[PDB]
């Protein structure tokens, strides 16, 4: 895993010694080279995972997340170079360094075999994200959003540290392979109940769970575009990955202890979806859609069946790609019209036809159109939850309506109808925005051809 | 003050602390404590302001009461043991008296009331000297007598110090009072782990000393005493704002910075003894310390408060302050996590 | 740092170099009293350094290459705009007054440093003890508001207590009629826009609040317009004075060492000029200050320290 | 009411005015064209196409098809000796010591 950490940490001299006019070109070129290099993690075996040393390993669950992260960094570099065009050079280099540090922390978080190292860099991912949100956010409410995000995460995740140190003192090790071969059942006691709660609540907050999701429609809105990409495409999936890793040790208490939380998502993904029917804000609409999809992921993890696990992996990857693309489209509209409200700019298909095509395709992939991997993940979670209980299909099917009921709604008021008369600064679409949309979307449709590389470690 | 006299007084402070550290007799511990108090009194009176006189008077009265209680404990242990060797005490009453005496000396709650007072009324260098150097000798005396320390009393003092320090630092605007309440919370952290593993107490003491030295050196370099001048610092020099943001990030225990190193290690020595409620409660309370550190970083570096017209004149002059060991203390306090097992040199 | 505690320890006492001619003499008067040349006349009788009156670009002459910087970097104010528009809505009057007070403070610090370091006497014009006589003359004419006076009083109270008053203060008495005659005589076009009531208020606050204020802290000498034309009489008067008043008598070597350490730190001198009081006349917003500071860094010889600028031709940077 | 000194908000810049052939990456035309070429070359023709070729020719991912071949052995054994096609026990019940009760 040293072959990816070292070039990522050498990206900082690359971005700090470059000229004032070629930082973007050099950083995008070398991050695309690292994304190409990332494909050597597909050497997965049907029985054994890929173990590199005592410190790092990568099974078939971490590999799609690593490839997605190192593919996502150049996309952020291309997106965040227009609202920072007038910025000072030193602050531009500091922003690029924050992005590089965030990628380095993420790609060594996804590969740590030891759990306290995973916790340490899982919380080291807080600092660059928070700095980006509270520094390069636009309006006044970025400070409150940063406070909410940081304090929800830390107040949920300090008992996780306490529980992990207790595990290290009790079992004797925190290596994931040793814990895979030394796992003991957890009996029925109040101590084990709070053990389960301390292990679960950090990832509950970072998923987010309904009722603990109040930091999402702030931090996903006040942040800049690259902050929106990392907020919607990696960190939520990082919480899901941690949940998948740590649910191994919490058997068989989970078989009843997951009983409330499933309801807190099974109803929750209804309510937040209904919020998208009556949202006056485009970015808030995308954030609440992310809440609903990740609640579906929560249910899939908590019922702990194989089909649900592969559905959760495919759903996480597909939702990350789709949410990043939707945030890019909303940011392009916000750059053109200088307001975030959805009803201000209407009828943009008459002026911007190809961006309307990208909008249509992104909305179609949002509402789980087959044979996309969004539909594959949603379908597999549906099969597993039907095996769990029958009436759950109702809670699925109604959601299958409401999702489309906002997605096409998001397609209409932003693209269809009569255009706004007084808005006359609708410039034609740049090559950069179209290239960003294509680089977001074409990997998703190509992954629809060969989905078996994202179907989890038990495929 | 003459430079020679100031140097002699500073070496007298150092000699008093060293005398407390290296002696094996209780009378010499008392002698070193009086040496330290008597020699540190004029440093607080460096400017000859009414506030400095009142701060020195309050410090004198608190230290006098603490020293008298310490002598009472020494005399009781003399009566009930017939010896003066600095080791475990042979009476619970003498142990209790000595523990509250050293708690009054360290500023532990509910004897903390002088710490935000006194630090406000004295200059920045003298406040740094107080909050870092004056805490070495009582911690050594607490280290030597831990076989006789009551667990209930020391843990009550630790949790009271942490809670009161967080809730006190939540309110202030002045930087010196913020550092005082942060000091109170940090000594609650250091005394909470003393009876389990004193090596972690030494490690937390060293890390706290480095962080307080870095923050006070930054404040002296920028000549800032309130939060609004610290906000103004962004126009004069941005690198100073970056440094104070990173140092305040590290002071809150945010990983991967070095401030995560002590407290986490403390948890590792309290879940071994099957004490789970107390470290979780202490981390939950230290979130408030993180909150007012976050408020300071919001005011200083993450935004830009408005400046004045005369600040342009300050653009024409380079700084000439002897920022001694500022880069070394900034590096050592923030990137020391990957060398965590080096704490084994303190065992 | 060439001076500090170590030089004081080894024997560089400031009382060894202070002679009987090491006096701080400040020459005052109205805006056209003809005091200027008179101070220079004193400067060519006792061998004293003559500091000209501190304007907007005094600090620009002290540092850098000595050239005056553009007005958007230094001051952000105009004297001619104040003369033409004394009641401007952008607060140019109080902004200029505060900048002039800061320049006078810097000049007083430089004068004190030169006097305490070389032992040579210094002649100044309109020191910080005689700047408020303009400020009230603004406020009594309705040019500025009361909060400007409150901010000026706060800044002066927190920054004037750390210095010493001059040994001799010289005042030139010229009526406002002859002042306006001189103003018409010189012919600076913006200067006829001044009013006679402004000069009358300047004279009133000179006589009623200033000379009684430092009658006791220094020796006061008052001259009219035709006694000032004879410099020999003036230097005869200042050479026959018995200095037994003020705080200059009880000055030990330690006190002058502390004062010299204070005046040599220019950022410490101007520490309390930019106090965080938000008045609309002096408060500059974040974006404007950021843009102006970024422009200031791009000037030649201004990005780095005074010896680390390669664009002006400094060598051996890698060994410094 | 008198207010503080502040620059007014600058007007929104259009990149198509000073450069009608702009790709939207930078104001400098040569830097614009080179950034577009770098993005289009290393994104589409280096990572996307070669990555699809790499994933399409992965060497027997997760041993999957190998198991199919092994099944084509095992049934061929177990249909030739009259053995049951699948046993109901994963391990040999002889070598398992059940607790007595």
């Amino acid at each position: 895993m040293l072959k990816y950490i070292i070039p990522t940490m050498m990206l900082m001299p690359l971005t700090w010694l470059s000229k004032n006019s070629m930082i973007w070109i050099n950083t995008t070129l070398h991050s695309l080279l690292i994304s190409l290099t990332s494909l050597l993690l597909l050497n997965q075996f049907g029985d054994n995972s890929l173990n590199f040393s005592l410190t790092f390993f990568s099974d078939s669950l971490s590999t799609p997340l690593l490839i997605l992260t190192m593919w996502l960094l150049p996309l952020m570099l291309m997106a965040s170079q227009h609202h920072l065009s007038k910025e000072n050079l030193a602050r531009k280099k500091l922003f690029i360094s924050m992005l590089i540090l965030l990628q380095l922390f993420l790609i060594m978080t996804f590969t740590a075999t030891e759990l306290i190292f995973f916790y340490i860099m899982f919380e080291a991912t807080l600092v660059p994200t928070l700095i980006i949100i509270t520094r390069w956010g636009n309006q006044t409410e970025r400070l409150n959003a940063g406070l909410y995000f940081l304090f929800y995460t830390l107040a949920g995740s300090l008992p996780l540290l306490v529980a992990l140190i207790y595990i290290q003192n009790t079992m004797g090790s925190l290596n994931f392979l040793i814990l895979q071969y030394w796992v003991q059942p957890m009996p029925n006691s109040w101590s084990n109940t709070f053990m389960w709660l301390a292990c679960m609540m950090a990832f509950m907050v970072k998923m987010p769970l309904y009722g603990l999701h109040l930091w999402l429609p702030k931090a996903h809105v006040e942040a800049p575009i690259a902050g929106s990409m990392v907020l919607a495409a990696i960190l939520l999936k990082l919480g899901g990955y941690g949940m998948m890793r740590i649910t191994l040790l919490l058997n068989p208490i989970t078989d009843f202890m997951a009983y409330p939380f499933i309801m807190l998502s099974l109803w929750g993904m209804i309510m937040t979806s209904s919020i998208c029917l009556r949202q006056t804000d485009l970015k808030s609409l995308i954030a609440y859609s992310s809440v609903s999809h990740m609640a579906l992921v929560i249910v899939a993890i908590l019922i702990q069946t194989p089909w649900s696990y592969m559905g959760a992996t495919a759903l996480m990857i597909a939702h990350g790609l789709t949410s990043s693309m939707l945030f890019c489209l909303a940011n392009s509209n916000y750059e053109r019209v200088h307001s975030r409200t959805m009803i201000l700019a209407r009828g943009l298909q008459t002026l911007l036809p190809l961006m309307a095509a990208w909008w249509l395709l992104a909305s179609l992939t949002n509402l789980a159109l087959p044979p996309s991997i969004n539909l594959i993940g949603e379908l597999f979670v549906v099969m597993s939850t039907f095996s769990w209980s029958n009436i759950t299909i109702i809670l699925m099917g109604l959601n299958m309506v409401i999702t489309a009921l906002y997605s096409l709604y998001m397609l209409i008021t932003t693209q269809r109808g009569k255009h706004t008369h007084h808005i006359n600064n609708i410039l034609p679409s740049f090559t950069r925005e179209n290239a960003l949309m294509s680089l977001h979307m074409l990997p998703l449709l190509l992954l629809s051809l060969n989905p078996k590389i994202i179907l989890g470690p038990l495929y | 003050m003459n430079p020679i006299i100031l140097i002699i007084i500073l070496m007298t402070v150092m000699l008093g602390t060293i005398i407390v550290m290296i002696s094996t007799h209780w009378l010499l511990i008392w002698i070193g404590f009086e040496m330290n108090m008597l020699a540190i009194i004029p440093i607080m009176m460096k400017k000859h302001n009414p506030r400095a006189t009142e701060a020195s008077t309050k410090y004198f009265l608190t230290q006098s009461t603490a020293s008298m209680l310490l002598m009472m404990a020494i005399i009781i242990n003399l009566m009930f043991s017939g010896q003066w060797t600095v080791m475990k005490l042979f009476n619970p009453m003498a142990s209790m008296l000595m523990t509250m005496a050293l708690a009054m000396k360290l500023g532990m709650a509910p004897f903390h009331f002088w710490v935000p007072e006194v630090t406000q009324g004295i200059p920045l260098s003298s406040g740094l000297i107080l909050l870092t150097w004056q805490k070495l000798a009582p911690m050594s005396v607490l280290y030597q007598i831990l076989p006789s320390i009551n667990l209930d009393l020391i843990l009550t003092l630790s949790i009271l110090s942490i809670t009161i320090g967080g809730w006190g630092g939540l309110n202030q605007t002045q930087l010196r009072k913020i550092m005082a309440y942060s000091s109170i919370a940090h000594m609650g952290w250091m005394t909470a782990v003393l009876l389990y593993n004193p090596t972690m107490t030494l490690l937390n003491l060293i890390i706290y000393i480095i962080m307080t030295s870095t923050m006070f050196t930054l404040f002296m370099a920028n000549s800032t005493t309130t939060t609004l001048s610290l906000s103004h610092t962004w126009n004069k020099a941005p690198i100073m704002t970056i440094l104070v943001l990173i140092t305040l990030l590290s002071m809150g225990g945010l990983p991967p910075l070095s401030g995560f190193m002590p407290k986490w290690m403390i948890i590792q020595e309290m879940t071994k003894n099957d004490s789970i409620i107390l470290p979780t409660l202490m981390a939950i309370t230290a979130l408030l310390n993180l909150y007012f550190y976050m408020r300071l970083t919001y005011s200083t570096a993450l935004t830009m408060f408005p400046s004045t017209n005369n600040m342009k004149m300050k653009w024409q002059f380079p700084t000439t302050k002897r920022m001694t060991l500022l880069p070394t203390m900034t590096v050592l306090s923030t990137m020391l996590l990957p060398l965590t097992p080096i704490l084994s040199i303190l065992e | 740092l060439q001076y500090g505690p170590l030089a004081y320890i080894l024997g560089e006492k400031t009382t060894k170099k202070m002679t009987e001619n090491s006096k701080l003499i400040t020459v005052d008067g109205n805006i056209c009293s003809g005091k200027s040349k008179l101070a220079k006349e004193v400067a060519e009788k006792l061998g004293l350094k003559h500091f000209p009156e501190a304007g907007i670009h005094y600090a620009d002459s002290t540092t850098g290459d000595g050239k005056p910087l553009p007005v958007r970097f230094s001051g952000n104010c105009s004297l001619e705009k104040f003369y033409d528009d004394p009641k401007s809505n952008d607060g140019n009057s109080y902004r200029l007054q505060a900048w002039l007070y800061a320049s006078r403070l810097l000049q007083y610090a430089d004068a004190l440093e030169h006097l305490l370091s070389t032992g040579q006497g210094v002649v100044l014009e309109r020191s910080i003890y005689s700047d408020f006589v303009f400020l009230e003359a603004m406020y009594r004419q309705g040019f500025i508001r009361k909060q400007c006076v409150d901010h000026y009083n706060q800044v002066k109270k927190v920054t004037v207590c750390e210095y010493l008053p001059p040994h001799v203060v010289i005042y030139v008495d010229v009526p406002v009629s002859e002042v306006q005659s001189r103003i018409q005589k010189k012919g600076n076009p913006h200067e006829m826009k001044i009013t006679s009531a402004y000069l009358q208020d300047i004279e009133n606050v000179y006589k009623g609040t200033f000379l009684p204020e430092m009658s006791e802290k220094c020796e006061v000498l008052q001259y009219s317009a035709w006694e000032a034309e004879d410099a020999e009489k003036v230097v005869e008067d200042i050479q026959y004075l018995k200095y037994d008043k003020g705080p200059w008598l009880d000055q030990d070597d330690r006190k002058l060492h502390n004062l010299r350490m204070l005046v040599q730190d220019k950022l410490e001198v101007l520490n309390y000029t930019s106090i965080p009081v938000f008045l609309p006349e002096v408060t500059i917003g974040a974006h404007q200050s950021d843009r102006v500071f970024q422009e200031f860094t791009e000037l030649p010889g201004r990005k780095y320290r005074a010896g680390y600028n390669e664009d002006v031709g400094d060598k051996w940077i890698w060994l410094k | 009411t008198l207010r503080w000194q502040e620059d007014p908000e600058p007007e929104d810049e259009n990149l198509y005015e000073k450069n009608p052939d702009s790709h939207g990456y930078d104001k400098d035309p040569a830097v614009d064209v080179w950034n577009m070429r770098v993005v289009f070359f290393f994104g589409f023709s280096i990572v996307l196409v070669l990555g699809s070729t790499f994933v399409a020719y992965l060497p027997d991912y997760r041993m999957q098809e190998w198991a199919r071949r092994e099944a084509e052995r095992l049934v061929k054994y177990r249909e030739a000796h009259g053995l049951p096609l699948m046993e109901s026990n994963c391990f040999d019940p002889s070598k398992i010591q059940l607790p007595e009760d």
Partner: peptide, 19 residues
């Protein structure tokens, strides 16, 4: 349009005697 930065009243509510 541009990034919001703290104005006079924000700095005043952050710069009193107590929070």
């Amino acid at each position: 349009a541009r990034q919001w930065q703290p104005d006079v009243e924000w700095a005043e509510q952050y710069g009193g005697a107590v929070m």
